[PDB]
């Protein structure tokens, strides 16, 4: 998309302020390691040739295209090779060679010092300079979350801008900071996950696959639109994220603002739960459409079994036009379903695929099919009672000991997964437990495992990174929709060999006293999860018991005359003890 030059065309479109924003994500997502200055600077010499630019298109290199330009700029960086490693061969290649050897060597999880609330100094340097202080925001969440969604990251700045300045003023104290800080960063790190499994799809599964996913989640979402409205606006979105995946952040902004504009211009057809998000800010505008609540079932939808599975016809509808078929039977299947997750949908028209497979191929097709719907009900029986098994423990125990039950669970069927891993996604999948189980009864199998399938796809990238295991290979191998089944199949080799016993990793000492609530149940369950390796047969119960005598000697220790030599003198005791008491 031009005017001639793609730069004045973005610059004019988008306009200074998101431009900019815009630019500093990515040049930050693409050197996730350069100083915030060295981006600054790159990111005005930039924006004044784009203002040179729309001035007059014609100008000498006005003309080249945003990969050549954005990766020259990334390639006068700071004496590379000394700093930024590889990405210095990329800077050897033409495009749109280097444009993808960047991109290849884009880092997922790469430890910088994490994310901290420090509200007298960050307030001082606010009013100082809110320009550099919002900035460093993005480039602070841009390279830790490399495929953040650019244009959500600009909307989140505005919420992280909004809390500082009624923040800082009204000062009685900044604990009005907190609260708010603390439930972006968790918004921050949902809205990653969200996308990277978009991209994940993109690099795995390709298109269609990407394709499959909206159709039923949008169905779900906007069931009183058409089969047409929902494709176009899939076909849409699509290409949005696509060119978000592929680092194009400019291009995906603008086709961005233009659905929002096309879905608050035809709401009449998508969704009556759009008028006071149709009436917002342009990024509070698209960033309330993607969150927007599922519209209620028109009284018109058509009845199935007539279409799906009694008319004689369907093998030659499925012969001559398979993808339209298919499409029109997860259409209606998903409008009708905002209960289910978007995995479950995908794999219910997986198996209506493999059955018509099978049948069409039978003498007497439509004896065959006729039960189709039949095959679905086993499928939708099981995430609905693993549902139901983890709510209930969840209310009955509370978090912290769901999430030590969830901790057991995967440390023995991977323990070779690195111990902070397995407290992570044990910690996050607790999480869930607390939003999703409290909800209203229909709601709580899609929070969950939708839920759950961003972090299942966040294990399958981590994983990717570094591999521990052929069996996660595997079950991160398979299609969106056997995912989950795959990692509920997924258990202890028989043929596992216990993690040889350490002493120095069960003993504790005075430090943990002091530390914050969560960091003292990160040591507890990275304790807990190391029993289990070690102990790999041992009972929850015992797991229970044993870490139940854990926390009553750090209580004690902790609140002893002389700290140490509690730890000292009890610690080797219950050590050499607990050993005896597990399995």
Sequence with gaps: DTHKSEIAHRFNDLGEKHFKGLVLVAFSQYLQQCPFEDHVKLVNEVTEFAKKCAADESAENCDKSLHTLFGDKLCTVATLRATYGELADCCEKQEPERNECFLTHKDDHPNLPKLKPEPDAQCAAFQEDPDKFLGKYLYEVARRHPYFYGPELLFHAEEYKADFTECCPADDKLACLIPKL??????????????????????????????????????????????????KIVTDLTKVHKECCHGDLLECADDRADLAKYICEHQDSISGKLKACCDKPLLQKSHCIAEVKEDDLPSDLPALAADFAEDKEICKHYKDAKDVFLGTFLYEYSRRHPDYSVSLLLRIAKTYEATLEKCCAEADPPACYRTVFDQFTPLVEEPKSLVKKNCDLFEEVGEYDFQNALIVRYTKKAPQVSTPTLVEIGRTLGKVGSRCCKL???????????????????????????????????????????????????????????????????????????????????????????????????????????????SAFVAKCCGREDKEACFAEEGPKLVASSQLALA
């Design 182 to 231: 603390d439930a972006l960063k968790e918004r921050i790190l949902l809205s990653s996950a969200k996308e990277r499994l978009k991209c994940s799809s993109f690099q795995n599964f390709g298109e269609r696959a990407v394709k499959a996913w909206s159709v039923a989640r949008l169905s779900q979402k906007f069931p009183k639109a058409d089969f047409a409205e929902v494709s």
């Design 440 to 550: 209203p009864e229909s709601e709580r199998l899609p929070c969950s495992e939708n839920h759950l399938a961003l972090a299942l796809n966040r294990l399958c990238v981590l994983h990717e990174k570094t591999p521990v295991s052929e069996k996660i290979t595997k079950c991160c191998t398979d299609s969106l929709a056997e995912r989950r089944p795959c990692f509920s199949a997924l258990e202890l080799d028989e043929g596992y060999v216990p993690k040889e016993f350490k002493a120095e990793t069960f003993t504790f000492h005075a430090d943990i006293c002091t530390l914050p609530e969560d960091e003292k149940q990160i040591k507890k369950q990275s304790a807990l999860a190391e029993l289990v390796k070690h102990k790999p047969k041992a009972t929850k119960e015992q797991l229970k018991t044993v870490l139940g005598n854990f």
